[PDB]
Amino acid sequence: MQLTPREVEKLMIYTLSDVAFKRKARGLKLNYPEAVSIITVTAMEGARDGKSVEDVMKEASKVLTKDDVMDGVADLIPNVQVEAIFTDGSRLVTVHDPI
Amino acid sequence: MQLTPREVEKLMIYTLSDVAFKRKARGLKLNYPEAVSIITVTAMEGARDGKSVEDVMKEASKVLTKDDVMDGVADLIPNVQVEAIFTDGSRLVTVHDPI
Amino acid sequence: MQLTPREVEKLMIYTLSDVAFKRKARGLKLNYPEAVSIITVTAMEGARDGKSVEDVMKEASKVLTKDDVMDGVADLIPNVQVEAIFTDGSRLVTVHDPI
Amino acid sequence: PQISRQEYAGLFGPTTGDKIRLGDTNLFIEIEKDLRGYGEESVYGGGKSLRDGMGANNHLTRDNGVLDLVITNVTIVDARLGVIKADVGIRDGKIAGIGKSGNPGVMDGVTPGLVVGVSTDAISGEHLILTAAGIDTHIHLISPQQAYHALSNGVATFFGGGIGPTDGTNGTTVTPGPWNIRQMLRSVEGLPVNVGILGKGNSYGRGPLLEQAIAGVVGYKVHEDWGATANALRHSLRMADEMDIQVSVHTDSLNECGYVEDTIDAFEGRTIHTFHTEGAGGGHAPDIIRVASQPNVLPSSTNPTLPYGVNSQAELFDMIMVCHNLNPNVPADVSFAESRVRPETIAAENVLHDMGVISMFSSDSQAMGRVGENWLRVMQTANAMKASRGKLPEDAPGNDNFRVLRYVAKITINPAIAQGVSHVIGSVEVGKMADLVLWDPRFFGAKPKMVIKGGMINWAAMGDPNASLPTPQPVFYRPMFGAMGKTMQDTCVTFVSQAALDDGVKEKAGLDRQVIAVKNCRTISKHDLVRNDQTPNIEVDPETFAVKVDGVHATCEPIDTAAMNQRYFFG
Amino acid sequence: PQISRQEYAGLFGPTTGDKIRLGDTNLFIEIEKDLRGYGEESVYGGGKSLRDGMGANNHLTRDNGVLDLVITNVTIVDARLGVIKADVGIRDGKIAGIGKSGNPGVMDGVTPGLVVGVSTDAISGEHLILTAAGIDTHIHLISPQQAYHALSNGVATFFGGGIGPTDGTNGTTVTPGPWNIRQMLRSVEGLPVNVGILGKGNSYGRGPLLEQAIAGVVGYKVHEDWGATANALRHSLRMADEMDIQVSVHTDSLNECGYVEDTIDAFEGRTIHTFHTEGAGGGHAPDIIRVASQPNVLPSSTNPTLPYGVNSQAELFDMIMVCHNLNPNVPADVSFAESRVRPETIAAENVLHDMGVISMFSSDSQAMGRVGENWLRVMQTANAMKASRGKLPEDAPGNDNFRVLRYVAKITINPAIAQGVSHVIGSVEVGKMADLVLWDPRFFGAKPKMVIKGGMINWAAMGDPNASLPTPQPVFYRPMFGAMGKTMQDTCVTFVSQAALDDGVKEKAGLDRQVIAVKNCRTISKHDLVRNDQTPNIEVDPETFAVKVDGVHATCEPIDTAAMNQRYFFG
Amino acid sequence: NTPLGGCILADTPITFNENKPVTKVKVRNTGDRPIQVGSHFHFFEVNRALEFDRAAAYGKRLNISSTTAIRFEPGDETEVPLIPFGGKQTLYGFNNLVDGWTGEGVVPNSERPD
Ligand code: NI
Ligand code: NI
Ligand code: NI
């Protein structure tokens, strides 16, 4: 596999996304790390599916609303950054206020 | 996310819980780390759901029986400790002999 | 759990197998780390199920074909090595060209 | 010209009269003063005040004043004279000045001990909070990873003892004998925090204590497991007088040698540090809190009891069986715990913190205490006591500064005063060491951005190192340049007694870390402790364990939902 | 007074006559002796014997006897005179005494070298097993992480060679030339284990070997890849005589220079260490076990073959192609492997360990061997040989001590004797270094609780550092204070030759680690190896590779399910 | 048979140090709080609240197994057997009442009052 440190640390963020989606299935208001986990995974999966930077930014904003998270989580997240591997290479994904 | 080391190490324990309930689905006798993994996740999920220390201790004892684990796993587990984040804060969860 | 370093590093390889199986479900050509992830987990799961070294080697070769992976992934994988815990102990699993 | 405070707050941050909410709590902190002339605000960035001939200057670094680092206008939260907005200066790993930064040659009202030049590297002080790093007086040296979890919550100083995961260390903070002391002073070379080793204070002779003082111990430790006898304390105090160090006590909870009033007679009114003054961790059951009424005492507290929760009663009945290896089948072991799990003193402990009686806050890490939840559990108690007891007569009519300044003093300046390291570390004052913590008010008391130690960042929040910025996920805390190579040792301090320093422990033990001797441990009292100088009368009922302070029952109802926990943490 | 052994075992642990089951195996170990007068048992805890004026004492440390650490009542498993219950004392990183601890002034029958005082920090010895740490004579220095996996199974000593992941190192344990030796002696400064570097023993001249001796090697290495010629061995042994060091051999599997008869004549009856005496790892095929019949030889074995499993045949046919870069398409490369995969010698190897012929155990890490399963695979073979061959005539009628004492000797005292470090470490004896391992009998041979190195805990089982105890999950092994700062170097030993020690390798190479020289390598024989002094007659059939020992076919049927593997491990 | 890591103890009870004198004494807790005294604690140098024949406890510890302690509740009167210390019988600390030796015992025992 020859997993570089950038690839190894991108697995602990995926482990949290399965817990975020599993808690969403039971009907729970996501916290700060859980909300950012499920927001960042859509950018990595979007880049894997071959989606453009414009599409993944707007798609990452339409994942969760204010009723899907706890009271005050939207106030402390005015921006969400993450780097994903696209067809052309590694590109930044800035989501200005997804809730 | 600003994941503190206490949060980062709590992901490797959840990675094992998915392998423990996947092996339980196929009908396999769980070993020492797998048994403790699915015992500890119910305390973390219980604390996330807002369950009290009394409820999660008794619920963690009624997850697996002696027939659900390998011969001798109950003898080496007279106690199971783990810290989970409750509504009031981080609290200890001691399960005296769950099998 | 008393997880030795050999057991801790075997969780990051499991985290990738769930992403490989999830991308396979959507219909995506697996890359080098994803292909090797889903190849190695069948050896660890095979060893857990009690399958012999002969069975897991041949079973690991019949998981994916050239159409299930990206163009050129078969050329850079003439061999796949991994160690799994069998009923008799830890044993090597060499899969000479699974595609 | 004139502009609204909304656009000013969005760039330069708050000022005089602006109130800041501390996360999801009900506490608001107002700025008492702004030490800057409006118009010449110093900030770094593309085409901003800090450039050649504007904020910088052509003069040399030797001109005492050129800073090595500057925090561009931040809201300080100090216990001496905090809740102020000012530019803080760093030079030689110490706080140079607190006021206004820039070039005095082209800017009016620049503070003399605060000038930006060619040697300064700025920090974005705006929209953030600055404070002195936390100190933990009860640390069982069970694991070295413990420091990473502590430093990940704003605790850059440790005080305690131990070898490793030995049952002896698991229950008592001791590094006994010169051999163990030297090995631990040398193991601490690979740690990114200040350390103060405590020796065993259990002896009838003067000699065994003298051996540990000259070896390099900041104080002594008297545990019930090693025998908290009247002679063990008398001799530990007698030696602490002639050595100028602090003794920490975990009194006999069995009431074997005597009662609580007999151990106070054995103290002979000499200054002493009392761990877990409530009683969960240890001490003469039931009336331990009674010790916090005398002035010589320096009361501290473990953090698993604070804040007082609804489910706290259940967890501690099983927790008590592992720390001091008590059996659940022996009647003398379980019946002994029935008294120590008293819930009336835990609620009293929480209000005594608000009244200003329990002068400081510790943990008792991996032995009935959490090291990575200290600053958090302080602010959690502050939210509960404001919501129940309301604003104090000393507290202002429109802000909760007095309570926060009183509560931050328990983890910053008071533990430093207790262990004789006030002059080194404790408060954000001029001439002191640069051991500071930075957090957003949104994540105050739980998750800091950076942790400056000796003018260099030791630990901080960091994203993907391969990424184009430091903010991209996964953002988990990692060791920085202040915790790498020889700079970790330079920026960290191995505290010892003067005897050890004079003998030459740094050379004999070969310590590349900084070595500062502790002092002013014995003459200090509760009046010298900041914002917690009260010595009230006490009356404790021994049957039902009810606590009455000045003829008034001290208690409070438990809370189910506390401030900042599942909303920020994951596990 | 009188009390039952059930309540005594629940507090103070077992004693004379009590048998302990070693995990899920069929082996039971009985206590041969209890070195304590019943009544004054020393244990630490809340209100127990070890307090001021009871177990402790007012006298100073310098009174030779005050321990730095004591293990309160543990079941020792030593090969010299093990399976005993006694208090073990630690002082100056060495074993002070083994018997009874406490204060002789108020307790009767306290051993003179064993006294608890103000300098002692106790360990919960009860309900646990103590032993000497393991040694691995075949270690390819391919990765430094290898040590963490080794130390995570009770192996605190390494012996071998290498630079890093070079094909040269991947197949041979060599650090060739003074430059490479120096760089490796200096890289080992950041390792938490004892190390013994082996040089290349392939030369016709005396000089190239002398350069490596004085550089700082504990011995030489003769590999088939670098040429295992009669002259390479003769000159390696000639130099090993005058230098007092041990040569390790991996004989020519191709039978190029000569047969097994040619190599033993080239040895000239001089003491030598033979790696993989079975033949999977290497050595002139087929009759490589035949070398075990000579007394000068010190036979060791790799651990992928032990225990002999049903599926062991398949993995070896492919594993052999990577370690010594053999191609699967060349006929000369695959046809020589057909002989080396012989399954009759693997079953003989397992029976020869029971008979006491193969005197020690190694691994051959990351090159046909696993470093983190040595103690495990020793106990796995012990379970298989008891279940098949039954109790020995020398073994007792009611316990399996003789087999366990014979098998623990293969990893503890015998490899230390072979490499001339018996006096430093090997057995739990007085005056030796404190390199000890602690495990529960439930998790014996697989997962230890702690690993004491030079009197300090180097590695141990640890939970969440932020938690209120060391037991909460996730419990994964992490480096302790004995592996932090300058204490890692102090507690670890860089073994070298006398020639190097007298030359001043510690000063020339600048080694902050402890430097002890190896001695008594040449005069030793098979009789000096503990519990494995057999030199039986041997007859090997060259066609079908059948092995007959003293006119009796040595073999055994393979096993499908081995003891302790899936039940405890995850991966 | 026994479980993994278990102990097959022999059917024989342990005998605790014989040929040592025994002294039975009635101890009553006068104070309103509970007191628990450990095996090797010196009874003569205990709390003044406990009312008993103090002179009979010279250099004598409890006659129970080591480690273990027996609890006394407020008011409750309990009989306790006492055993002398071993070796040189030289004890130090506790409450500075004696800090010396107690095995003189030359015919009727005398010297050192409270
Ligand atoms: Ni304590
Ligand atoms: Ni080899
Ligand atoms: Ni090898």
Automatic annotation (TrEMBL), chains A, B, C:
Quaternary structure annotation from Swiss-Prot or TrEMBL: Heterotrimer of UreA (gamma), UreB (beta) and UreC (alpha) subunits. Three heterotrimers associate to form the active enzyme.
Coiled coil start-end: none
Keywords, in A-Z order: Cytoplasm, Hydrolase
Pathway assigned in UniProt: Nitrogen metabolism; urea degradation; CO(2) and NH(3) from urea (urease route): step 1/1
UniProt key word Nucleotide-binding: no
Record localization: Cytoplasm
A single Gene Ontology CC term: cytoplasm
The reaction(s) this protein catalyses: urea + 2 H2O + H(+) = hydrogencarbonate + 2 NH4(+)
InterPro entries: Urease_gamma (IPR012010), Urease_gamma/gamma-beta_su (IPR002026), Urease_gamma_sf (IPR036463), Urease_subunit (IPR050069)
Species of origin: Yersinia enterocolitica W22703
Pfam families in alphabetical order: Urease_gamma (PF00547)
Family: Belongs to the urease gamma subunit family.
Protein name: Urease subunit gamma
Primary enzyme class: hydrolase
From TrEMBL, chains D, E:
InterPro entries, A to Z: Amidohydro-rel, Metal-dep_hydrolase_composite, Metal_Hydrolase, Urease_alpha_N_dom, Urease_alpha_subunit, Urease_AS, Urease_asu, Urease_asu_c
The Urease domain, residue ranges: 133-571
Pfam families membership: Amidohydro_1, Urease_alpha
Binding site for Ni(2+) 2: 221, 250, 276
Catalytic reactions of this protein: urea + 2 H2O + H(+) = hydrogencarbonate + 2 NH4(+)
Cofactor(s) needed: Ni cation
Keyword Oxidoreductase in annotation: no
Pathway(s) it belongs to: Nitrogen metabolism; urea degradation; CO(2) and NH(3) from urea (urease route): step 1/1
One Gene Ontology term from the biological process aspect of the record: urea catabolic process
Active site: 324
Record's subcellular location: Cytoplasm
CDD domains (alphabetical): Urease_alpha
UniProt-listed Enzyme Commission number(s): 3.5.1.5
Keywords, in A-Z order: Cytoplasm, Hydrolase, Metal-binding, Nickel
HAMAP family: Urease_alpha
NCBIfam families reported for this sequence: PRK13207.1 (NF009686), PRK13309.1 (NF009834), urease_alph (TIGR01792)
Protein name as catalogued: Urease subunit alpha
Species name: Yersinia enterocolitica W22703
Gene coding for it: ureC
UniProtKB/TrEMBL annotation, chain F:
A GO molecular-function annotation: urease activity
GO cellular component terms, semicolon-separated: urease complex
Claim: Hydrolase is one of the keywords in the record: yes
EC number of the protein: 3.5.1.5
GO biological process assignments: urea catabolic process
Compartmental location: Cytoplasm
Pathway, per record: Nitrogen metabolism; urea degradation; CO(2) and NH(3) from urea (urease route): step 1/1
Catalytic activity annotation: urea + 2 H2O + H(+) = hydrogencarbonate + 2 NH4(+)
Subunit organization: Heterotrimer of UreA (gamma), UreB (beta) and UreC (alpha) subunits. Three heterotrimers associate to form the active enzyme.
Name of the protein in question: Urease subunit beta
Range covered out of full length: 34 to 147 of 164
